[PDB]
Amino acid sequence: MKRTFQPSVLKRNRSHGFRARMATKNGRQVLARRRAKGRARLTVSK
Amino acid sequence: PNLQPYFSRCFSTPVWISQAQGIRAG
Amino acid sequence: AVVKCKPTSPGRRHVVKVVNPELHKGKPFAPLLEKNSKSGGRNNNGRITTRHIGGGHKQAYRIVDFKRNKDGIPAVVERLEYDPNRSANIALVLYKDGERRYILAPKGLKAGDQIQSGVDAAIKPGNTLPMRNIPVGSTVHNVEMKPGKGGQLARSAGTYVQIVARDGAYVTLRLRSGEMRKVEADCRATLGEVGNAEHMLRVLGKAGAARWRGVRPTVRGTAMNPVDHPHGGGEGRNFGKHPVTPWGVQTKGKKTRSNKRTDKFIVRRRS
Amino acid sequence: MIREERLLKVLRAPHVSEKASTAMEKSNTIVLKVAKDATKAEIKAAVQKLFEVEVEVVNTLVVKGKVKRHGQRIGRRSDWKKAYVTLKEGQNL
RNA sequence: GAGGACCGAACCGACUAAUGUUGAAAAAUUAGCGGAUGACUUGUGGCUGGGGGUGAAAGGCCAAUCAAACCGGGAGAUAGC
RNA sequence: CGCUCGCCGGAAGACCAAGGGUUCCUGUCCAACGUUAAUCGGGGCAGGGUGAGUCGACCCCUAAGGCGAGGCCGAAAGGCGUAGUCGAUGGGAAACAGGUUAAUAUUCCUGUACUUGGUGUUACUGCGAAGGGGGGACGGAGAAGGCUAUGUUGGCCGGGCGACGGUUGUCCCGGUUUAAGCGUGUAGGCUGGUUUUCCAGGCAAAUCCGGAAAAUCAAGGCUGAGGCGUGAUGACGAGGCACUACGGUGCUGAAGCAACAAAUGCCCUGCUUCCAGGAAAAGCCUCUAAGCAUCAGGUAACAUCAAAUCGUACCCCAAACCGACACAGGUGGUCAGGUAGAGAAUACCAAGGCGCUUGAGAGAACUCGGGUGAAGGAACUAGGCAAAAUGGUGCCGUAACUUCGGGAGAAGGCACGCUGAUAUGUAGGUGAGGUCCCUCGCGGAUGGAGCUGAAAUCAGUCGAAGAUACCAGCUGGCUGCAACUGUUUAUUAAAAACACAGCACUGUGCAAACACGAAAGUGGACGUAUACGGUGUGACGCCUGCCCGGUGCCGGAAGGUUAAU
């Protein structure tokens, strides 16, 4: 029926985007943990 | 193309959460 | 007057409307308006801090002059207007120098009446004077508690206070709840009583009539679970507990005033 | 008015398509692959200075890079900008 | 010409029955069914964050997860079984 | 590819937004992928394809809300918030029609426009803001009138003359299109107009707004569909004709009118009416202050240039989106033809799109999904579950009870087709030329051809049946509960539960009680006791008994006990 994932890029980039992650202390720790892991894509952005 | 570049494991388990009728007491 | 509706429906049967043909049939005075967006009972943390608020009709805030600082300038009431933000009606007045203001509507007030604020006015409904010049026993409304601040007492639809005694720099007022409260005599007050005194006679009739005022439904604490309200659950309709708030503080009689800063101005609490 | 060494870097390659040659024969329009940051004024300044002809209107578009699968991986070609330079009446190149 | 008016499509729901039950579908189809100018319905943004929210109140819902979500950690908890 | 056949047509068609990201088009391959085969494909491979001053984004403006210099708070992290700055789902600026590609078009090309901004002259020149005032600028419902899209028929034009009886008529088939823009300014709607004087207003100061009188005219201004002219002797155009692989491209191209019926679209953000009393800011117009001097700007016409940059293919009720799938599901907006019909229901069709990616047989049980039944009619069964039945419109008729509204479509009847007359088409609707007058032009009055057209009654007729299909109420009686509409356990419970209007008690004097928050603060509320919060009860009607020992709450504080100190 109506499933849980209804995509919108604007709601994506405002929730999980790079500037949303770089706004707070706990999102810069997310981005620190994803550079320390070696992740290809850092955020949802591109 | 007789090269065989196959695929992999490509999602996890949906539900084993299944039917439950049958008792002997309540 | 009040008028019972003919029961052509359920939800129309018990309705009693309070119609006033003296009210303006048109859009209100535009310079004195303001955007008034709803809250939901939600504070700046975004949490519900007052339950049963939300929805309702869009409202525009009318800027009402409670201070009445145009002293000595005669005004004339252009029209009485409905106000969705309060219980009273409001009166678009127009001072002699061409300024339109909104005041609360007194009881004997119609379009074409005169009002005048200032200490050298006459004693008639709509006139605002500081209470050194208002005689004792006069019914007054829109009473300031601090001199020059704005009216706070006696502002709902059919309300008034009585200046029941006066000596020194303090009058004492019998408020509408029955409280005898001292107020320093330099405070202003409008004569008369507030005008929409038939407001307590209307019946909403139906559940959605409360819903288009912004009153969401009240869930009864006994109909909840023990996790939600101290009025618990129970196999059936059980109570067995002293009645409390949702936060466990006892209702049905426990007094909650604790203000030692202002109790020197209360000379008798309500009965 | 654009600096001369900037104009020498915008016109990458003349584009051959059989749509591009229809435009050259029927509407006097040369179709050029240009640099990615080329503006319609920089193309107009470069076709006039370097091809020694006259230009009415440059129309541009940006062609998206196709995703191709060379071998076993997933590559992506580069986006490129494509001009539609409409010369007025005299055609040299 | 009013109405949480009436009948009835879109729409929103989900009363009954049959099918389906390794399904076409991790809740649907088919035939009927209730509301359908309203306490309606819907789009697009927003806001409330886990002993917390939100709840016309069912322990409901909070990403197919809810009498305390998920992820990572304490952590190789402990386990007279 | 062709000829049939079936299916959808308020969608299974056409088109946007989202989302996807090349799935688009062409040539190639057929391993795997495709629930079969495949020469085919949304598969592989290689090319090609997306063209903007006007569409969208960007941009200017703000809403919710975010962030937030200083600031206030807070072990720290940080929370809050002022200025301010972001944020559309809203407000601000301008293009249409034909033609075109294998694939792009309001973008290319022809034709005709239009917008904004930068830049070169005239007279009379006061221009000038983080300011002032307008305006922008706003609800629900309802009712028309004026239209139009569109349709329908007639006329015109082109063609036909019938594979089986008839068919040179009052026959048949097809077409009868044309926009922005510019011009005029009427059906409507709104509004008294104009000068002159004065002032405690709009923090200033204002020749604007507001106010106050006063002279003179209500004959003035805004607004606004649609017409009609122009755009346009142009384009398009049925069809013939060299073209020529007859696909197709190519040259031609006749008519291109009128009447009637028409929206859910426009006038209309109007009008009327209601109470629940219905964004904001800019663009815009206008007023000036500091400022400023035949400077700088403004204003008009004319001339020049500039309008960047991104998006633009394709899918969108889907095999490209969300559902692990080429998944019977979900998915915002727009367009919406004919014949019946009240209708976007439904039936059959058009434009258009498809036949759902395994078939061929056979015609056992049994199982799904339907059809029909003698006689009986609920005997079935937990239970009329399921099925059958009822079903439309008009008219007659309709009970107890009732809160006087209802109950009520109660119940129950009857009339329905087709043809003819009444009347070669009526009642109405529309309305021509004609007549006549003026403020003589988009008029007014009469006029009443043409066109359209129910409904009814008589008579006749046909069938077993005339709401013939689809479509489309089973009804009544007595009771429990809940006043009611509503809400609820997404995914076994829709209820008697919840909510409710009402009712009562209680708190609450405003820096309100409460709530969120170590706090600041913020909700309550820009409210103020006719208000708010909490609790219980649950429309209405009649009512609300007795108990203050227990337990709370409230009030009292003489005594007894009692902390830190």
Residue numbers in the entry:
A (entry chain 6): 1 to 46
B (entry chain z): 3 to 28
C (entry chain c): 2 to 272
D (entry chain t): 1 to 93
Paper text:
To determine an atomic structure of the NC containing an intramolecular disulfide bond, we prepared a sample with a higher oxidation ratio of 63%. Thus, the shortest construct U32SecM with four cysteine residues was used to determine its cryo-EM structure. Of 266,000 particles, 210,000 were occupied with one tRNA in the P-site, while 55,000 showed electron density for two tRNAs with the ribosome in a rotated state, indicating two different stalling mechanisms, in agreement with previous reports. A disulfide bond between Cys22 and Cys32 is visible and an α-helical conformation between Phe150 and Tyr28 is found. Interactions between GBC and the ribosome involve hydrogen bonding between of Arg31, Ser30 and nucleotides C1259 and U1260 of 23S rRNA and between the Asn24 side chain and the phosphate backbone of C461 and C462 of 23S rRNA. Interactions in the lower region of the tunnel include hydrogen bonding of the carbonyl groups of Ser19 and Ser20 with the side chains of Arg84 and Arg95 of L22, respectively, and of Tyr16 with the phosphate backbone of A508 of 23S rRNA. All these interactions potentially stabilize the α-helical conformation of amino acids Phe150 to Tyr28 and the loop formed between Cys32 and Cys22, and bring these residues in close proximity to form a possible disulfide bridge. Notably, the residues between Cys32 and Cys22 are also located within a loop in the native structure of GBC. In close proximity to Cys22 and Cys32 are Phe150 from SecM and Arg95 of L22. The formation of the observed disulfide bond between Cys32 and Cys22 might be enhanced by the tight space inside the ribosome and the surrounding amino acids.
Cellular protein synthesis takes place at the peptidyl transferase center inside the large ribosomal subunit. The newly synthesized polypeptide chain passes through the ribosomal exit tunnel. Here, we show that oxidative modification of cysteine side chains by glutathionylation, nitrosylation, and disulfide bond formation can occur inside the ribosomal exit tunnel during the expression of the mammalian eye-lens protein γB crystallin (GBC). In this contribution, we integrate liquid- and dynamic nuclear polarization (DNP)-enhanced solid-state NMR spectroscopy, mass spectrometry, theoretical modeling, and cryo-EM to show that oxidation of cysteine residues in the NC can occur within the ribosome exit tunnel in ribosome nascent chain complexes (RNCs).
